[PDB]
Design a protein around this ligand. Structure first.
Ligand SMILES: Nc1ncnc2ncn([C@H]3O[C@H](COP(=O)(O)O)[C@@H](O)[C@H]3O)c12
Ligand SMILES: Nc1ncnc2ncn([C@H]3O[C@H](COP(=O)(O)O)[C@@H](O)[C@H]3O)c12
Ligand SMILES: O=C(O)c1cccnc1
Ligand SMILES: O=C(O)c1cccnc1
Lengths: 346, 346
């Protein structure tokens, strides 16, 4: 793991310089395509991409797990929904599935700790049958977290060997917005009330309790904000850990990762804490309608492209943004050149 | 024309009600897909769509024209760029072309008043060789405007007969951001300085002049804000007129139109002024980096989905948003049902 971290490549400034010059020469007023230009340059700097903005195969990794904190009354979805939806992922009927198909991306469902019998068709990396209840103790051990980080990162880089050049990250786990808020509070130093949202339709009246639970998890565990692994293990979850692992794996592989919503932001905070080198590989997708989104995003210094008021999770936002990534590539490779037309623009 | 306007259909509330109920039953927490749900419902209410969110063929209409106001020093692109780029549109090398291809949409280039010899391959609807210089008089006559509105609206609805279900609107015309700002100022009652932007890289030092020119156009012409046709003819342009005509045509046809950037917002303001019935058919795409964008958008009560800092025009933003429209459809038609899984969510 120390290996893995040490070995994350820095971006290729040379390729980036070349990209910028090429972009500037395209059939348009310089800088007119704004964030699409910036995206293209970012992509060009990713080693796994071969010095140019390009997209080969696309995969969306969905990390599923249950959480002990569900027992705290913080979630209105029945616990079993994780297992059910997990199965549905295999049938292509979920929101992420449908959006992925539309983007031409494959969905990989990974069980990192669902509290149910194994589900045929789902990738098995189960840590346990749900994580510990953070309100009264840690979600898991440091060991467990590190091992999952390792296993997921490996699985991720291995897909690269099969043609995947672009990843999307997602989750599925009833009550997971609670550990997410805890993480965000810890990393950003924001008070719980400012970051705790309604999750999956939590009734407004149940908010207070959710805020109390978050506070308790923190007081009780005393996670160290300067130690991302510390935080994840204590007040995170297996799913959260898994998402952070996708991030670490893609970065080590020198490939881009599209973030999703609130849960993904929390994992991203951890990833960057653990390895700042990860940062340049991440790509925001959309702006989650979850209350703590703005805070989380500010801390990652990220500005999402899509404003859809989405709050489903599963990596749905991630899939929705893939076409954008492809557009920056098409722009780069298929547009004509100013010089070729004899056009001269300031 | 009075006919045309009279005959724009209202949205089908029945279909919309049915859509909403179907959406609520999908495999997800109610309302979790936010703006994608709202979009789907909007689409369902469009008569030309057959009671359901669906997308058949896609077309992007690019209205090209020159403006007399170019002589006022308000644009740094050489006048000839309109004609050149217009030709390029036919070769598929422009930004809109590339983005359309990626969205699977066809680009239709229409010459409504380029100041050059006709361009083979381009649809010919030329009013004149460039419009009058608004700084010293009107862009054209009311007659001319009405006729173009008519011709474009017809051409638009006719495409519907060929399978097109979704339109994108765009333009090409050196100096066109000037008439655009004038229109915006007039419709919104905002002062010119607040709405005049850099257009295609206008040097910061040249701004003042642009603001003066806009003010003059207004003082000189005295356009009536309560008469959209009045405004377009006086301080608009052939391209602006043409975009408004796409809007009127799509609406009469009961079909959706995706807006583009700043120029498109100006045309949209006119369209809604002329016929409020048009409103429900319009769909924002992105949030233009042009200074007057926020003001224009506020007046249309619209919130774009995409934040790309784009400012190219041509209908580039429009094409970029098409996949989003398709995603709302896929969601609607391909997602599984809660009931089918036995899942019950508050
Ligand atoms: N709840 C859900 N039900 C059905 N399908 C879902 N897909 C995602 N979620 C979402 O709800 C969970 C977080 O919400 P909370 O903290 O309030 O429990 C996660 O599974 C998130 O993916 C779903
Ligand atoms: N300028 C352009 N050059 C080359 N390709 C272009 N495609 C769009 N535009 C853009 O620039 C024009 C408006 O900018 P202004 O008011 O400053 O002249 C329009 O043609 C707009 O489409 C282009
Ligand atoms: O922002 C998200 O991804 C989200 C918000 C609520 C519930 N599930 C996911
Ligand atoms: O917002 C736009 O569409 C735009 C802005 C500047 C120049 N051309 C187009």
């Amino acid at each position: 793991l120390h290996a893995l971290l040490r070995d994350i490549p820095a971006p290729d400034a040379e390729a980036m310089a070349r990209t910028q010059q090429h972009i500037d020469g395209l059939l348009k007023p310089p800088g007119s395509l704004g964030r699409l230009e910036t995206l293209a340059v970012q992509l060009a700097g990713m080693p796994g991409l071969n010095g140019t903005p390009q997209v080969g195969e696309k995969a969306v990794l969905v990390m599923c797990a249950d959480h002990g904190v569900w027992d705290e009354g913080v979630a209105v979805s029945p616990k079993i929904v994780t297992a059910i939806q997990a199965a549905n992922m295999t049938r292509g009927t979920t929101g992420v599935c449908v959006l992925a198909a539309q983007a031409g991306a494959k969905v990989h469902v990974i069980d990192v700790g669902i509290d149910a019998e194994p589900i045929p068709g789902v990738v098995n990396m189960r840590v346990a049958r749900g994580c510990g209840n953070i309100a009264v103790g840690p979600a898991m051990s440091r060991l467990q977290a590190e091992a999952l980080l390792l296993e997921v990162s490996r699985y991720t880089c291995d897909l690269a060997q099969r043609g995947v050049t672009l990843f999307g990250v997602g989750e599925l786990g009833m009550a997971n917005t609670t550990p997410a808020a805890a993480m965000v509070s810890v990393f950003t130093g924001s008070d719980a009330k400012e970051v705790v949202g309604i999750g999956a339709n939590l009734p407004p009246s149940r908010i207070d309790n959710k805020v109390d639970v978050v506070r308790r998890a923190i007081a009780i565990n005393q996670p160290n904000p300067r130690d991302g692994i510390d935080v994840l293990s204590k007040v995170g979850g297996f799913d959260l850990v898994g998402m952070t692992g996708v991030m670490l794996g893609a970065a080590r592989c020198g490939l881009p990762v599209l973030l999703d919503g609130f849960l993904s932001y929390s994992a991203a905070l951890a990833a960057c804490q653990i390895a700042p080198a990860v940062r340049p590989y991440l790509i925001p997708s959309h702006f989650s309608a979850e209350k703590g989104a703005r805070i989380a995003l500010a801390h990652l210094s990220m500005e999402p492209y899509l404003h859809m008021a989405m709050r489903l999770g599963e990596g749905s936002g991630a899939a929705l943004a893939m076409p954008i990534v492809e557009a920056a590539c098409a722009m780069f490779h298929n547009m004509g050149e100013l010089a070729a037309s004899n056009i001269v623009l300031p």
